[PDB]
Design an enzyme around this catalytic site. Structure first.
Site, PDB file in Angstrom:
ATOM      1  N   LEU A 191       0.771  -1.236   0.000  1.00  0.00           N
ATOM      2  CA  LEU A 191       0.000   0.000   0.000  1.00  0.00           C
ATOM      3  C   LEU A 191       0.810   1.298   0.000  1.00  0.00           C
ATOM      4  O   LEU A 191       0.475   2.228  -0.736  1.00  0.00           O
ATOM      5  CB  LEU A 191      -0.981  -0.021   1.175  1.00  0.00           C
ATOM      6  CG  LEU A 191      -2.257  -0.832   0.912  1.00  0.00           C
ATOM      7  CD1 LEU A 191      -3.039  -1.096   2.203  1.00  0.00           C
ATOM      8  CD2 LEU A 191      -3.107  -0.061  -0.081  1.00  0.00           C
ATOM      9  N   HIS A 192       1.868   1.361   0.812  1.00  0.00           N
ATOM     10  CA  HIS A 192       2.726   2.552   0.906  1.00  0.00           C
ATOM     11  C   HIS A 192       1.877   3.827   0.980  1.00  0.00           C
ATOM     12  O   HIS A 192       2.042   4.745   0.181  1.00  0.00           O
ATOM     13  CB  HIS A 192       3.681   2.631  -0.303  1.00  0.00           C
ATOM     14  CG  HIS A 192       4.648   1.483  -0.405  1.00  0.00           C
ATOM     15  ND1 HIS A 192       4.736   0.679  -1.525  1.00  0.00           N
ATOM     16  CD2 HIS A 192       5.580   1.019   0.461  1.00  0.00           C
ATOM     17  CE1 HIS A 192       5.679  -0.230  -1.342  1.00  0.00           C
ATOM     18  NE2 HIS A 192       6.208  -0.046  -0.145  1.00  0.00           N
ATOM     19  N   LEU A 193       0.981   3.883   1.955  1.00  0.00           N
ATOM     20  CA  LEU A 193       0.084   5.020   2.106  1.00  0.00           C
ATOM     21  C   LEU A 193       0.746   6.313   2.555  1.00  0.00           C
ATOM     22  O   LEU A 193       0.484   7.373   1.998  1.00  0.00           O
ATOM     23  CB  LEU A 193      -1.045   4.664   3.077  1.00  0.00           C
ATOM     24  CG  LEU A 193      -1.898   3.426   2.777  1.00  0.00           C
ATOM     25  CD1 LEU A 193      -2.833   3.195   3.940  1.00  0.00           C
ATOM     26  CD2 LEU A 193      -2.684   3.602   1.492  1.00  0.00           C
ATOM     27  N   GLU A 199       3.766  -4.434   3.444  1.00  0.00           N
ATOM     28  CA  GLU A 199       4.861  -3.808   4.180  1.00  0.00           C
ATOM     29  C   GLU A 199       4.665  -3.434   5.649  1.00  0.00           C
ATOM     30  O   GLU A 199       5.615  -2.999   6.294  1.00  0.00           O
ATOM     31  CB  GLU A 199       5.364  -2.572   3.423  1.00  0.00           C
ATOM     32  CG  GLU A 199       4.491  -1.332   3.561  1.00  0.00           C
ATOM     33  CD  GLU A 199       3.259  -1.357   2.680  1.00  0.00           C
ATOM     34  OE1 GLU A 199       3.034  -2.362   1.979  1.00  0.00           O
ATOM     35  OE2 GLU A 199       2.506  -0.361   2.691  1.00  0.00           O
ATOM     36  N   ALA A 246       3.182   7.659   1.826  1.00  0.00           N
ATOM     37  CA  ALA A 246       3.760   8.365   0.696  1.00  0.00           C
ATOM     38  C   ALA A 246       2.747   8.696  -0.382  1.00  0.00           C
ATOM     39  O   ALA A 246       3.124   9.012  -1.503  1.00  0.00           O
ATOM     40  CB  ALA A 246       4.880   7.533   0.101  1.00  0.00           C
TER      41      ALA A 246
END
Lengths: 343, 343, 343, 343, 343
Positions: free
Chosen positions: B93-95, B116, B97
């Site tokens: 997902l890398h939310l 992650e 960022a």
């Protein structure tokens, strides 16, 4: 045959020409061996062992009373008197380097067989190879000792420790000495770089060491740079490293040339490294020589006539110089070994 | 449960979140798996292989219609439309960022789980390590390539050849990435030197590599000298190397920081190295994610309540932001995952 | 003697026939070397370096003025003009593949010594071996690169990652190219399988690699099964693999024959691999040629009458064609080198 | 802060508590370092190197006038006058073995931090580990030396030569010293056998050495038979070997206990082996202490209140004896470090 | 204390619970040891060696009369009469698999300590592990034996020969048995692939093996493909391989499950593999159990209250079942060990 084993008298020489195991093989075959008392103490081989092996513990003169005398070093002046015609002497002679001895043996008519000149068709000196092998194994050991601060060295460990870089051992020569030194230097943790002029040799060395050892073509550029950064420099050949290049070496660095301080660099010049480990050298030497000793004790001079390699080991016989190298060196009459043997 | 596997639409992304093997395990347990056509082509897994495994080949929208969608990368604006309350989206997902996405998911009510943020007790991120692993292995591979003159490099071969000294590879950091870089750089013949702050790691690396790799404590002095002689510098951490030090490096040297020319030094900046080898990455990721996919397929959201690790993976659920990191990141209300799940 | 080092003008050729280090050696012996400016920039050797070496940085024409011209590549038409009778040209000539060059040299009466024909008694080409070596170390590296998906490859890492199987690299030929390629492929983590027709060579390779490499008798069945599962196929010999076997390889696989897409398999056909690593190749080549440059520099043509191997390097002298092979290929008058040299 | 680095006056001590590169870090961070002239000579680090590093080359008294004095060995009587209240001393103290010192330090009110008591959660002594490591790498080096006949050893080579069996090295303890001894012993080609009481440790060592080294559970039967056939015996623990067993040892064998002659066995008792290679040790030690020095320089004693491991390093402060082992040993009032620090 | 060592009466059991060396340790500390005549003959330890160690050679009944009885296997119905209240029995019990024994032991009031339940904090079973190690080392040894045609196997050699590909060994489980089986299989030249669910274990295995062994995440896909190409299949875990997959296996393949023919494949089902090498096993078991016997003889039951790991080895005491697992399996009253002990 009555075989003799005198005690090495040359100072500091602790090796012996025959082990108890070798004696047993002889006695077992019907020969008789006279071993001078204490001849093996230098290598931890006591008279008692030589006794159980079947040998006869004798004195100095008795030992030289045998048909064949097997030794390690050459005869010292003090021993020139035991040299006689019917006596076959088998030992390291190095005649080309001692004119005195060359004449004393010649005048005595003694038949002398040099270990160093016995040589196979491919040119290898099978009775000299053992010493070359321990010398190499020893070089990085002796080198490490002298990199030690108390010995005035740089004060570093060849392989360092986790977190600290290993030292640099540069080896000039990919021969028997070079390769054995590399094995040990590599095993002690150093970044080993070995140089040589022969490419096939370096290709082979790359195979045996994986790629763990750096191989450089022995060009002047490579020698200059390798020496400059070496903590331990091991010469294994014989003008390849001039006192000019010396100044390029870091202070504390040590040099061990198998073949005191100068510019801050510690030089190690003590001939016989194999002499520091007498017991090992002895087995290394006798395991190679025993087979030949067995043939001589079994067929006398006929042994030499049935083995090209052994034959070449002959230097003096009935006053004749049968080794071309020594002849040319002293400008003396060279008699073909086979010829002199049959006359 | 009906599980959907859409194709990755983010340009150049060729990995796939589920393999034919993964599909077989789900289908074998009774789930129906919808795989968008060509979802695996980027990795060499054809529709045909997915069909034989028990998967159904569908269109983009049909894939997103499943109860649980499994992707690799985050939903792009173009997909924000498929987000819905009952849907459980499992992917990277890398939310933190990407506020635009986090706001789209929060407003949607969808329940999102990021690969992650899945975390084990000891703090390792099991679903993120695989990528660090292939990145590490890729590092010396890309460096080598760029060391080739045609690409502007110094024109050297890492391991050299018999007679020619190998090149120097310096790896900053002994973690997952740095350790995998080391294995390959060493394998390619280069002289590898890896620096790290933790001594136990250096001791460990010293053991696993025998002595083949030079371990150095990451002191400023050691980082300075290593960088200055490096032919290929690999950064594996994340301010350790300043443009100042950059001028110390010989020209043509290249840098690859897993975490264009400047001063004659070639910099490699192309994020997803694992992307160059999508099929390997695809298995390294799915081999770890699959176990979780199976749990989710079998127990629904209760998979999270029966696994603390899988629980931390939750980032959003019914309008609640359940990851402290993402919250602190956008200045948003943080709702405990276990709390948001039970309401 | 005055020696000329012309900058390689063949497009893309970045190797230099002499290194600063080689120049210093020459000058040290009282020789004078004329280096064409920028001749060594392709390999990272600057004019300043040659200058410190004692070289005189000259221009193109001046450099062809020396008695001997040491080059890397053969003379291009544009250079034919410099070819003259009292000139000794030492370089790669490959005359049997350039009739125009052959005659141009024969007409100019220039004495041209080919690197590729200097040959030892056992038949090895010592000045060509260096290039065979870097080519092999390169095969797997370049193979890895084209295995990347962005390059159209299958998208896999040769050594995989913990838990993901390594790829299969098949090497046809256990010679110098084969063996060197095996080292790097093994190092990169691949399961290496090497095939050869000679059993003793396989025995040796089995010994140098422990067992880490699969040795297979080069039977057609073995070749066929190996090619079929290969991710990377390395050609190292010279019809050993037909477009028929090609259809047996998995899509994405690549072939690097050291001696574009066809059926989904990537074919790498870019000649001089050593070329992508000019600096390394330069040293590997100049390390083996320097000894001969020195001999010619010191004894002129007598060098050829004093070294059987160097003599077989003579291809053309005073209009004579001293190399059998090139004569037979172009149906021309072959004159024995030693003979033509003495007339 | 002002950091002083006195020269080690303890006879034969050649290490130095700070390196030029370490001075550079401190100065870079606004501190001033007073290095006593000649402090690094014993380790090959000149006054000039320290000067360029930004240090102030001072005399004996100036160095002790700093806020924090960093040393290697403990203060000798002659140095007791320099102990004062506001002073923070960081070095190996070994208080439990020196009452006079401890009292001198408590009376002066000097805050003394000891390297050896800085302890991590899992129990390791990170500032002591470095020395255990060089003592270990050094053990077979020194043993080999005394195995040489001139030194009175049995006269053998640890790894023999081809055809001659290697020597036997037995290591008592698989800790840090022991494992580091094994690496070097195995590397010199000896038959290494290491004993230990922890099975997990032996499993670990077995994985790290392949199986090249023999692992024996440390039972009395095993210890007894191991010592009896040992050519070199390294002690690495701390009654494990009684004079009784000593008679079981072959003569000439040597014993090196890291933790003269008797029965023919040569005993090597020379305290600090890391002292033989002072340069390697300084870097091994300082590479570990530097980060701690940086922390003490930056935040003073607050550094201990912010690091539990460093806290246990406190042995004295404002007259308070802050270490339990020492307190109990001398029967003095013990005061918890965190308490004494806040008063 | 009076300690007794009965002879193992279970058919085919040849290990012994105490060695002459352990007896020496016990006797040396003042305890008296009764070894039943012929008790160690199955391991090559004669009654005379035990006598020389200080043991008293007794009859079956006398050995059982000791305060503490040390055995290898569990009591047989025929030995139940020896059980009494004041007796402390230390051996392998495996109570959860023998209700009858658990009942007999409770009715006798005997205090039984099981080797296999003695557990460390991290959960390892230190007295069972030795057997897992020898079983593992044996698995491929026994596998090769049956891969032999005469035994009905496929007829292949695990590592093949130069020119012939090696066989495939697939190990299910990266645990102790699996890791040690890998060592031998890899040593015998096979292509070893080992599977496991835990990634960190696979990471570790990759480090210890270099790259010589193939690590595969234990997904269903990998197990199926792995099994299908396996020449030798080793089970080292405990429905992972169904009779379905068994059909995918090549004929002649064999299966060795540490944890007859069916479809052509050869199943090897003979319980105790360590039992084929009793001597090696006796020592590996007794080397771990001796320290505990020494603590138990010295402190009696206080040894359990002073060691949490050994405390867990308590199964029965004065009629109380102190092992939760056994208690739950048979549905009987569980009494915490610490409690039952203090009453």
């Amino acid at each position: 045959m009555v075989i003799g084993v005198p005690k090495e008298i040359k100072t500091l020489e602790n090796r012996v020409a025959l082990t108890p195991g070798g004696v047993e093989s002889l006695v077992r075959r019907g020969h008789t061996v006279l071993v001078e008392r204490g001849a093996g103490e230098g290598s931890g081989l006591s008279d008692a062992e030589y006794a159980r092996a079947g040998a006869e513990l004798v004195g100095r003169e008795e030992a030289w009373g045998a048909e064949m005398v097997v030794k390690v070093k050459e005869p010292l002046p003090e021993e020139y008197g035991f040299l006689r015609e019917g006596l076959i002497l088998f030992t390291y002679l190095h005649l080309a380097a001692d004119r005195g001895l060359t004449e004393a043996m010649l005048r005595s008519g003694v038949t002398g067989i040099a270990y160093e000149t016995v040589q196979l068709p491919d040119g290898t000196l099978p009775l000299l190879v053992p010493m070359s092998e321990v010398a190499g194994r020893m070089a990085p050991q002796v080198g490490a000792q002298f990199l030690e601060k108390p010995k005035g060295g740089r004060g570093v460990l060849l392989g360092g420790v986790p977190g600290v870089a290993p030292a640099s051992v540069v080896i000039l020569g990919g021969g028997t000495v070079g390769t054995n030194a590399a094995k040990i230097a590599l095993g002690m943790g150093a970044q080993v770089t070995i140089l040589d002029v022969n490419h096939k040799r370096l290709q082979y060395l790359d195979d045996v060491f994986g790629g763990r050892v750096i191989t450089l073509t022995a060009t002047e550029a490579n020698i200059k740079k390798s020496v400059q950064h070496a903590d331990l420099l091991i010469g294994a050949v014989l003008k390849l490293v001039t006192r000019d290049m010396l100044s390029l070496m870091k202070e504390g660095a040590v040099i061990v040339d198998v073949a005191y301080v100068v510019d801050g660099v510690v030089h190690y010049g003590v001939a016989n490294m194999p002499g520091a480990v007498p017991r090992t050298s002895t087995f290394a030497l006798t395991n190679q020589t025993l087979p030949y000793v067995l043939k001589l004790a079994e067929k006398g001079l006929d042994a030499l006539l049935e083995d090209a390699a052994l034959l070449k080991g002959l230097n003096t016989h009935k006053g004749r110089l049968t080794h071309p190298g020594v002849a040319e060196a002293f400008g003396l009459p060279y008699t073909p070994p086979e010829e002199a043997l049959r006359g």
